[PDB]
Ligand binder design. Structure first.
Ligand SMILES: *[C@@H]1O[C@H](CO)[C@@H](O)[C@H](O)[C@H]1NC(C)=O
Ligand SMILES: [Ca+2]
Ligand SMILES: [Ca+2]
Ligand SMILES: [Ca+2]
Ligand SMILES: [Zn+2]
Length: 409
């Protein structure tokens, strides 16, 4: 079932730029002693990376903050509300000052009940929900590290089905790995593709974690494991004349020649990246130009996707469904029922007749000539046709208007 390109995507090293926060209670538990706590955090991330090796993820600690003064959220024995408060704090307070793919709260409070942490599921790189929360419940750093690794498994799309698999043979059950993978394949989140700059990492270099840090030139693991002719495993220095070791654009300790491909296209709105002969790094993932016809002329590319009404229906509604006929979209001429184009001022605002395909999305099943739509008292964008969907020949949605593509891109 998995396309060869999917299997191969499954094997690209992936990275998380991780930020950890220590709350006031763990801080006091550790006698206010800030180097002791930083050390224990570094043991912890190291433990994670040892566990996440077989998964192809490397966790790079890019920030560590201790609330040695007061908590900036109300941390509560109720695990849910602390996870809720911490997710909002991440989105509103942490991201504006500090890029990161993920953050965990590590806290000394005693959570009510059995719960030692909690996480949102398959949400990595999400501003809102790429966050977990972990209780520092033991003096044994390995154990808290394991829970930390488990709450991150949740962010990476592993399910609770927990209390084990259906059936089989520190680590993850096979069912937890298929879940995680499916999630990666289904969402392919963007952020875990970039290799963080070695400068950006705040933990001590570890020579042997397979990630090249400041003061190292290569890192192929333990001397017992390493079999590179390029790298000296003990010292993490390149060998005689080598320019590189295990980067995607290295071959036989040298830069590959220009134009060798290094990240395949994942579909027709992706542009392949190609090695430079100039360095050992694969150029950043970028995509085809905005407006390229895509998915058999059914759409036009927008920032690396091919938005199509039928697929947005299926995403909202599950497979088995498809876009409604054009007549359904008339409803968008008014603001009663599903009908919508824009929120302006907290007021509801109709589509002009010419724009009706860039308002609320209308889907259908069988029997149903009923025009179904998706709504949210919560979030007035949910169910709205995605920007950049095709609305006529050579026309796309931009700001909830149907516009000439030559004016959009
Ligand atoms: C690693 O580097 C040192 C330089 O101190 C060298 O003499 C040592 O034997 C090297 N080890 C290997 C296995 O190349
Ligand atoms: Ca990233
Ligand atoms: Ca290293
Ligand atoms: Ca690309
Ligand atoms: Zn668990």
């Amino acid at each position: 079932t998995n396309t060869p390109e999917q299997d191969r995507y499954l094997q690209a090293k992936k990275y998380i730029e991780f930020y950890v926060v220590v709350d006031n209670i763990m801080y006091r538990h550790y006698k206010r002693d800030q180097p002791v706590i930083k050390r224990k955090v570094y043991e912890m991330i190291n433990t994670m990376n040892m566990i996440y090796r077989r998964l192809n993820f490397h966790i790079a600690l890019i920030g560590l903050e201790i609330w040695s003064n007061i908590n900036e959220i109300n941390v509560q024995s109720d695990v849910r509300a602390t996870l809720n408060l911490f997710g909002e704090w991440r989105e509103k307070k942490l991201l504006p000052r500090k890029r990161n793919d993920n953050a965990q709260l590590l806290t000394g409070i005693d959570f009510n009940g059995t719960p030692v942490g909690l996480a949102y599921i398959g949400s990595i790189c999400n501003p809102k929900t790429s966050a977990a929360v972990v209780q520092d419940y033991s003096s044994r750093t390995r154990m808290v590290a394991i829970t930390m690794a488990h709450e991150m498994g949740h962010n990476l799309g592993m399910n609770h089905d927990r209390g084990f698999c259906t059936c089989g043979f520190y680590q993850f059950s096979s069912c937890s790995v298929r879940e995680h993978q499916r999630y990666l394949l289904r969402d392919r989140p963007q952020c875990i593709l970039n290799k963080p700059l070695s400068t950006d990492i705040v933990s001590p270099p570890i020579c042997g974690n397979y990630f090249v840090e400041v003061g190292e030139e290569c890192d192929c693991g333990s001397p017992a494991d390493c079999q590179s002719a390029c790298c000296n495993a003990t010292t993490c220095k390149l060998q005689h004349e080598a320019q590189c070791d295990s980067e995607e654009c290295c071959e036989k300790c040298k830069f590959k020649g220009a134009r060798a491909e290094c990240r395949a296209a994942k579909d027709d709105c992706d542009l392949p990246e190609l090695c430079t002969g100039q360095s050992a790094e694969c150029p950043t993932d970028v995509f085809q130009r905005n407006g390229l016809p895509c998915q058999n002329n059914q759409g036009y590319c927008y920032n690396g996707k091919c938005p199509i009404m039928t697929n947005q229906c299926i995403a909202l509604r599950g497979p088995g469904v498809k876009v409604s006929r054009d007549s359904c979209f008339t409803l968008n001429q008014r603001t009663r029922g599903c009908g919508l184009c824009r929120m302006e001022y907290g007021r509801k605002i109709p589509c002009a007749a010419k724009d009706v395909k860039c308002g609320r999305l209308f889907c259908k099943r069988r029997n149903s000539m009923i025009c179904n739509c998706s709504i949210s008292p919560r979030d007035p964008n949910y169910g709205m046709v995605e920007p950049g969907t095709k609305c006529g020949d050579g026309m796309v949605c931009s700001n909830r208007q149907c516009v000439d593509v030559k004016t959009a891109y």
